[PDB]
């Protein structure tokens with residue numbers, strides 16, 4: 001039975017960035033523990049679907065421990081022990097009782113706390129959820145944690161030069177389709193929607209990336225779903241059966257069909273909304289002394305005057321920081337300001353890299369070029385509602401251009417002339 005003044009439950013992005021903030025805020029040896037079911041210290045999860053899969057110069061632990069993903073210092077296991085912050089690894093909590101402030105591990109150990117930070121992130125929706133036949137065949141893989149990534153690297157090696165089917169057209173789908181093609185697989189991506197990345201992309205943006213990918217040799221099958229998987233006598237996947245009637249041969253299948261916030265330990269004990277744990281502007285739940293951050297939190301997004309849940313990395317880092325600031329502020333008598341987040345999303349495919357800021361609401365225009373067979377692609381999009389820019393996307397931007405579009409999203413400037421916005425889209429951003 002161990003007690004700590006502060007317990008972070010989960011050892012991911014938000015956990016690590018919260019530890020770093022606790023350090024900055026003066027935490028003392030013996031005050032803080034992090035409990036994680038993973039066997040390693042907090043790391044930059046984004047590396048797992050990018051640099052981890054590169055066929056050379058790949059990312060590997062301990063290189064991508066937090067906080068190197070945002071250009072900060074690296075927090076190795078030794079940083080935590082030198083600060084007297086205890087890492088309790090390979091420990092999965094299976095029961096949380098918020099009244100008695102007690103956590104229980106699968107093996108029966110118990111942990112009590114005074115303040116709890118719920119940083120349990122998301123799990124992955126699985127094809128067993130859809131009732132897809134044969135979905136338990138071997139070499140049908142999902143990607144969330146570094147153990148998953150290691151299985152994937154192992155399959156990439158064992159099936160070298162084979163066929164991969166990627167089930168899903170979101171973030172995992174785009175990144176993994178690219179990764180498998182770069183590792184010399186024949187790759188087909190399958191999804192039900194009419195264009196990829198429906199959670200952000202417009203039809204116009206999606207067409208650029210889908211043409212890019214098919215020019216690289218990736219096949220895309222839209223408007224269908226998997227209905228079953230053939231397997232061999234060892235139970236290893238051999239083929240994906242589609243609802244449209246097509247059967248795709250496959251040595252590896254990777255699935256990216258959505259994440260789910262891991263809130264199940266807390267059902268009934270805290271207020272929920274939009275699938276996550278409802279919080280205030282300081283990441284406090286409906287239970288005092290219990291905070292939720294990162295992917296599990298539904299919080300007030302001040303600039304859009306709405307409750308939202310964000311399932312991306314920038315928010316996991318900044319929410320973690322805000323929570324610790326609020327906790328420390330409450331212990332002194334000190335005021336903290338309400339979280340004021342600008343959504344920042346990004347991804348990379350092959351030699352492409354885009355950034356998006358703000359809100360994808362209103363009607364869209366493109367600017368730049370747009371031609372996927374251009375020497376060096378560089379184009380963007382503005383989302384315009386009520387005469388003002390609410391969202392901005394840019395592929396191929398310099399650091400100054402990226403900062404400029406972020407300033408557009410943050411300040412929501414009015415648009416006088418649309419044709420002058422489309423010719424000179426970034427001149428507009430730079431004048432803001």
Ligand SMILES: Cc1cc2nc3c(=O)[nH]c(=O)nc-3n(C[C@H](O)[C@H](O)[C@H](O)COP(=O)(O)OP(=O)(O)OC[C@H]3O[C@@H](n4cnc5c(N)ncnc54)[C@H](O)[C@@H]3O)c2cc1C
Nearest residue numbers: 010011012013014037045046093121294295311312313316
């Ligand atoms: C492969 C991959 C690539 C990504 N890349 C990007 C990207 O490029 N850009 C971007 O904006 N976003 C990206 N994301 C999303 C981003 O990483 C998440 O928003 C971020 O990790 C959320 O941080 P978190 O702390 O809330 O959760 P997570 O980092 O998932 O951390 C949750 C932690 O809690 C542990 N946990 C859960 N339940 C328990 C329990 N019961 N007991 C003990 N431990 C538990 C988990 O094992 C894990 O350590 C990506 C996600 C994935 C999966």
Ligand SMILES: NC(=O)c1ccc[n+]([C@@H]2O[C@H](COP(=O)([O-])OP(=O)(O)OC[C@H]3O[C@@H](n4cnc5c(N)ncnc54)[C@H](O)[C@@H]3O)[C@@H](O)[C@H]2O)c1
Nearest residue numbers: 167168169170171172173191225256257258259311346347
């Ligand atoms: N660059 C990034 O921001 C980035 C990269 C990797 C992962 N992630 C995160 O990791 C989590 C997992 O990503 P994800 O791509 O699984 O989810 P996502 O929410 O980004 O995409 C879900 C996708 O599942 C597909 N889908 C739904 N039903 C399906 C079906 N029946 N059959 C085939 N496809 C179906 C859709 O094409 C949809 O695009 C999310 O939180 C995501 O934000 C983010």
